[PDB]
Subunit: 396 residues, 4 copies
């Protein structure tokens, strides 16, 4: 991060005047006196190469060239053997073809196998080569991209505010054009990964799939039907009447993480177990999602609420499409860009049962929002409980 | 959209009753008395009233649902239809729990009346925490190992030894292999499961930065070398630089593309045996050899020595204004002067060295993104041909 | 007509560049390009801009002669010493009367006729290291007697009790003197710059909005119109702090200073004013503190009628918001913040049902008028405010 | 901030009770019993329960507030004390009602116990609606006319006749008057009533663009001409250009400044201070823009400081994230190196040497820069004086 600080800070005397054109052969080449032009101009070789109007003249090139020939002459004999001369050429960028090497060994004429820089220079200048790089290298690693790209398709069926309403999911295999129904809970991957991640290996991964169940600014209850086939989203209707949060509107997109399972058979701490449900999340971005809408989010932290022996996590995340997404690096950043947000979310979950005659909620850690790494470990563990729920059903 | 700003239907402003969901197959009804005395719709009551529906209220709603399944209008339902009602209401019912139900209602004539159903419904409440979870799914596999692109600097800058090499680190096994940024980095960046709307087109390419924003030292993908690392452009041992002035945008190239000499743009103009060129215009300077996802927006066409040299205009998907640039026509709205400047630079860069102004295609016009993507596609096809015509 | 230009093709005129002009229009003969230009196959102007070398004395000569000629309108082949001074003047050479008599002497056109040659000869021998010696002090002399004030807010009492109060003051930034003000009467409605540098072609839309109920809260705070210096206070009933029971207000909710809707001015038939300042809903992503003041851009208004009184709810946005620039009118909201107008309207349509009320009645069927409409409502409100002060 | 992230005090989690607000002047109380029975605090029931407080609850609460005015515990209030308590509990009394209640309650012993107060309270309901509004006001009339900057281009670009003229249009009268960009455009942009947070430092300056981003033709404020319009750098009739390459940021001046080190008359080679605006948006020649100062770079010409202030336009998408010079490499990596590189070498092209910097090339922070600007603003006031 002090890469930033390097820019602001002053520079050494190497960076203010510039250096010699270097050989690239290391301490294996003897540090030289700059060429005459640099010395007369009072500008370094590299600065003259980079910014003077005229290109280096032939005598200047010869100087630089002999500094690079000498550099291969490690035992300091004052000459090179034809084979080293081909190395030099390959190093100068002129990748020669077998025909050429012998052609050059030939034209150079090493009257004793000894090629002096002078002899080289003379050959080099009489055989210019317009390097359009005629041969192209196909050497690749060629890995197999064994994967069928899918396009999610979301269909509404039935009527909202009635028992018929359902949001269904499908996958259109792109390489085959064929459609298949899928479970948003079991089939949409939890982690969103690229085939070839080009972001710096340095930057860790944080891109999760979020399934919206309750739209920002709404209060009508919807949920993943973990009981129904292909687990489509269904509205919460009891006795033909739709249910709602009575406390007020959910002020952030509220939903769940696919391929996750918090089990009432796995403990958090004595007395506290899981709630037999995918982990929930609240994405705080500015845009309202539609019911059942799926979006890529970034996890930032998690709030934990314990109710009747069951740990009920609330993951705080944010849509990668949100203008401020790039500035939220961890939970601690929500307050700076979204002041009061964490506070409202916690209060909402602390008091929402009061309205219908219940009490304030009991949280874990005295209501602390743990940081992203912790939220990710919850999600990860949950992913595993989900993989176990899948295995225990296969055989059974 | 403007549906939100526009006026509302008198059915929306006052509210509506609680529908059954069985369509016109239910006789439109009168609101329940309580909704009448309140002067508030049933739905608004269900949604916003501080209280839950009283039992008498739930019965009238439940009654309408019941009667809706009574399509003939007998005034009762066969136990199979009653079973259909329970399902509809979200109550799982198996031959077991089922039989015990008709044992409880007892319609000595199979005629289950609403009062007899309601009666039974109210005497068998069940906390539906849904005990049986459905595993039914498409369960797709994914034999893939995500690869981490690793970039490494080798040698020394401003000298003939500098190179940027590339590798794939298998995130599952951890093993690392050397790859050609030219041949192995995909041109098209695609999601394994695309969650964005099918109505939304794809426009997401990998761009390889060769010359950084605000600099002028030349570097290029060494198409001639094994695994084509990035090498610096050194001639006779002296580094080379644009003398006209600095490249003011990250300038670079698209992997898996090739414009071939052996192909014509139009009579007289061939390809130029290089991967296609790109100028990414976002605000962030990229490092040499750096790879990023870009949105393509259009292209400038330059012809020299009967050869076509395209300059694809693009913008990193991370740039703050990326989402607002939709096509080439949007660049002047947000980056006024940008295109003008990029064209002017390419129009005159050879003059300080004694050359002349350049000649463009279309009189210097920026073809739009659709034309630009085709230029990328074709060039991608040329790459495939280029690749076959070798192993073979 | 600015996008298009940068995208579109260029005239031959532009792609080849042109001659250095006299800048005196038709009064000058179109000329043939200088030979050095012709030998290069590069326009004169491209050469001066991009060639590595500066123009030589002979090239300058040709350029300066075309200029000189330009002043010689009737082609006499010479100029009067009087016109020569003009040329010197045009070339950027500040000439004090001393210099002028000197030039008339030093050239010496014993017949008043000064040829280009005589002129050129004189120019070359009296080189002048410009450095611009004399500074011009001419200027308008706008004065600012008044002192810049800083709005300061102090809190008194305990929040959620009848004693809490948000008091307003103006601190003189020069004296340090703090003086209590009324958010309602003293904070300016329109935010004005001393010198607007923003483009004139851009209509102003910058207002001060006083926040009463912060985003995501439900405690009823209000500007105390009946108390002196109208500080913010909470609504209390029978000693208990009042809250919205319908649910939290989901946007920053407040009012516009210097506005007023009187119960004595009609709007429609049997439609009066709320007898309060105009209320506002600011939709940015950021929650303000109770009584925090902010510049917002107005986007439209929604009109609620209740008991023959109009209850305007203006939709605006903090200029500080990341998408503020993109919402130019009410129609943009559904495009950047979909659901927002729906939710705001739905909220006000039903917030009273919770406490046994009925759904609200709206004007224009709840359509959201545009910003032109909102802005007319606001200016009117300012005049009722100006009249409310005069009547009193 | 991190307060939002951190755990909460057990009292916050549980919920607090309805306070007297009179501060410690009220005896801390037990939650009324119906609050105890709900296992929900008094304030949570008031803010979140569906129903209003029951009459027995309101009474218990009104009695805690009433007693809180009875600071010496007499057990009753004198009738002058009742008015206040009424307002406090939320009842707008009016001169007519006060007299009326001082009678109606009729404290036939001057004592108004709580029970008497309460009995009166329940038999008398007043429709507040607030009939009288307060017009008390500071009345800080600071009348002035809004001036709108108006810019006009004259002549032909790339020739001696191109000028950019500036004007003020009084938005009241609508009459225009030619002004000078150097002398008349405010260096400090100030709100006559600043509503932004007082704890937030002022940092808003006008920037007059001379050389647009990505261009290399030279323009400058004509310090020698009346109304100092912007002219093009023309010499012997040929327009001048930077030969190193294009300026890659908008380059211009700060109005009302003067970089001189010196009488009673005129002077020469000195200009307003130099600024480099680094936003993504190009500005036309002569365009003016509010900017945020971020730091500065100093070149020593020949014993003379040639400062270049780094700044960003307030309209830029990343303005808000750049708080000081150290923030630029974080959002515009390479931007400062590049600005430094450009100034280090722009004279090599034509046979000159690399420039030398003060502080080895360090970019001083915003504080140091606004200081340089202020001295320059003062230096400007002295010029203004000397001559006039
Ligand atoms: Mg849960
Ligand atoms: Mg190419
Ligand atoms: Mg109002
Ligand atoms: Mg300076």
């Amino acid at each position: 991060q002090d890469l930033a600080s390097a820019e602001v800070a002053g520079l050494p005397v190497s960076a203010l005047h510039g250096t010699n054109i270097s050989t690239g052969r290391g301490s294996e080449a003897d540090v030289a006196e700059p060429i005459q032009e640099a010395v007369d101009r009072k500008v370094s070789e590299l600065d003259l190469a980079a910014y003077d109007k005229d290109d280096f003249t032939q005598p200047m090139i010869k100087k630089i060239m002999s500094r690079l020939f000498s550099a291969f002459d490690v035992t300091h004999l004052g000459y090179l053997t034809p084979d080293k001369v081909e190395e030099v050429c390959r190093y100068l960028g002129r990748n020669m073809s077998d025909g050429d090497v012998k052609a050059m060994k030939a034209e150079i004429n090493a009257i004793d196998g000894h090629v002096t820089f002078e002899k080289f220079w003379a050959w080099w200048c009489s055989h210019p080569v317009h390097s359009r790089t005629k041969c192209f290298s196909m050497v690749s690693a060629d890995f197999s991209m064994p994967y069928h790209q899918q396009q999610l398709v979301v269909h509404e069926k039935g009527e909202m505010y009635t028992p018929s309403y359902r949001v269904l999911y499908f996958f259109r295999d792109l390489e085959t054009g064929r459609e298949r129904q899928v479970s948003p809970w079991h089939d949409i991957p939890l982690y969103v990964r690229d085939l070839v991640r080009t972001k710096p290996e340095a930057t860790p991964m944080n891109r999760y799939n979020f399934i919206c169940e309750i739209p920002k600014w709404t209060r009508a209850k919807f949920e993943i039907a973990t009981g129904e086939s292909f687990n489509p989203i269904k509205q919460d209707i009891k006795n033909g009447v739709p249910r709602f949060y009575k406390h007020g509107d959910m002020m952030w997109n509220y939903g769940a993480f696919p391929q996750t399972w918090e089990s009432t058979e796995v403990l958090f701490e004595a007395g506290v177990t899981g709630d037999n449900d995918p982990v929930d999340a609240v994405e705080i971005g500015m845009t309202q999602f539609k019911v059942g809408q799926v979006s890529a989010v970034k996890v930032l932290g998690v709030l934990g609420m314990i109710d009747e022996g069951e740990m009920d996590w609330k993951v705080v995340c944010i849509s990668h499409s949100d203008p401020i997404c790039h500035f939220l690096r961890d939970i601690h950043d929500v307050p700076k860009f979204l002041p009061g947000c964490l506070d409202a979310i916690r209060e909402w979950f602390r008091v929402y049962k009061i309205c219908q005659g219940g009490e304030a909620s009991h949280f874990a850690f005295d209501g602390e929002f743990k940081d992203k790494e912790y939220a990710m470990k919850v999600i990860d563990e949950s992913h595993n409980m989900w993989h176990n729920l899948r295995k225990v059903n296969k055989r059974g």
